[PDB]
């Protein structure tokens, strides 16, 4: 019931059109106001400039490119407390019941990690005692619950933590390591192209 949220891993990102500022060699560093924003992916590089592309000195010229990052679809990673795991066990006695009455004659027993002996008392036949315990040693160690829009799994904590994808922490927080979905091709003269790595 309500595992604590740990991560959000973006697997589908939508990019705006890239914006570029550039300078000639020995003219300064290029600057964009987009460069100071948290939800923007930028690269800051240098470009071979000269008389052939609008500069008076041949050499490296500063160039900056920025594209706004918004995550379309992200996989949610939940962290699991084993002490909060619950289970339901259905019990039933063989007497004579028709199949259609089985759902009526079944006692459903709910257990916590800290529940004691629980009773399934059947009217007329006494009662039987159940003392149970989950086995979560060899499948429930350092693990997350990873769920997409329609699917869910149990994954290694370290496997999901080592994913080469942008990730986030909870609220409207910054998308960390956006380069895993946004790359910038080498600049030509005064233009930089963005390589979107895909869904």
């Amino acid at each position, epitope marked *: 019931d309500g595992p604590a949220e740990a991560r959000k891993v973006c697997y589908s990102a939508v990019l705006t059109h890239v914006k570029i500022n550039d300078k000639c060699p020995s003219t300064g560093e290029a600057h964009l106001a987009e460069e100071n924003d948290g939800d923007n992916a930028c690269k800051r590089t240098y470009s071979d400039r000269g008389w052939g592309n609008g500069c008076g000195l041949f050499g490296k010229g500063s160039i900056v490119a920025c594209a706004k990052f918004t995550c379309a679809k992200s996989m949610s990673l939940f962290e699991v407390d084993q002490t909060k795991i619950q289970y339901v066990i259905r019990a039933q006695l063989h007497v004579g019941a028709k199949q259609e009455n089985w759902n009526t004659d079944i006692k459903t027993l709910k257990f916590d990690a800290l529940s004691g002996s629980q009773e399934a008392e059947f009217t007329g036949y006494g009662k039987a005692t159940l003392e149970c315990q989950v086995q979560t040693a060899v499948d429930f160690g350092n693990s997350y619950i990873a769920e997409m829009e329609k699917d869910s799994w149990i994954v290694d904590r370290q496997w999901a933590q080592d994913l080469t994808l942008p990730w986030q922490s909870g609220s409207g927080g910054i998308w960390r390591e956006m380069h895993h979905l946004v790359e910038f091709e080498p600049p030509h003269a*005064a233009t930089i192209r963005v390589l979107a790595l895909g869904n």
Partner: antibody, heavy 116, light 112 residues
């Protein structure tokens, strides 16, 4: 921080015009600029869009072959050369800055009327 | 394509609350979620009053608020004032091909 437009006026279809937008109060060479127009009884619409250096140019198909946007970062000026004007080009034209992928600051606008 | 629809005119009395809506097609408000609202008094330059759906520029009063629901952006003005009488423009970054598209405009009338 203000933008000022000038150059609008009356003209015939097929005529020519050249809008000028002067910027002050900020580093003009750091910001994308664009031209925005509103025709009578119609919605707002961007037609030209230039980068900080002037290296990246964007036009709409309505004005792609007829209008030319440019800028002079030395004199803090933004130009819109309008050629082969049409009656549909009659509108009130704005020059506006662009940052954060939004249209940030506007000018008061300059009226362009194309009449036969 | 990209068409942003919003009513021609909405009216309110001084001190009440008013809401202007901006409805579009398909994508165009829902994909990128950066929608800006503008205010234009007759003859003056349009003023950015809201951007990124709910963000407020420096010095824009707390009465102006913005919301989004799917393909609808909303500008809510509470505590109407006489100076609020202006045209209100809705803008949204549609895609990498259309870039920006505008609404038809809404004239608010404060019943002075």
């Amino acid at each position: 921080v203000q933008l000022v437009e000038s150059g609008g006026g009356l003209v015939k279809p097929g005529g020519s015009l050249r809008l000028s937008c002067a910027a002050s109060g900020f580093i003009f060479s750091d910001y994308y600029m664009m031209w925005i127009r509103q025709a009578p009884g119609k919605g707002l619409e961007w037609i030209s869009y230039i980068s900080s250096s002037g290296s990246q140019i964007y036009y709409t198909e309505s004005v792609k072959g007829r209008f030319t946007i440019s800028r002079d970062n030395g004199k803090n000026l933004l130009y819109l050369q309008m050629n082969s004007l049409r009656g549909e080009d009659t509108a009130l034209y704005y020059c506006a800055t662009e940052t954060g992928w939004r249209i940030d600051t506007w000018g008061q606008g300059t009226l362009v009327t194309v009449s036969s | 394509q990209a068409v942003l629809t919003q009513p021609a005119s909405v009216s309110g009395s001084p001190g009440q609350s008013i809401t202007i809506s901006c409805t579009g097609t398909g994508s165009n408000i829902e994909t990128y979620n950066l929608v800006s609202w503008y205010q234009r008094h007759p003859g003056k330059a349009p003023k950015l009053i809201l951007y990124e759906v709910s963000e407020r520029p420096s010095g824009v009063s707390n009465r102006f608020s913005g919301s989004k629901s799917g393909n609808t952006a909303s500008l809510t003005i509470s505590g109407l004032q006489a100076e609020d009488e202006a045209d209100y423009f809705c803008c949204s970054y549609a895609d990498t091909n259309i870039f920006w598209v505008f609404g038809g405009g809404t004239h608010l009338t404060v019943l002075g």
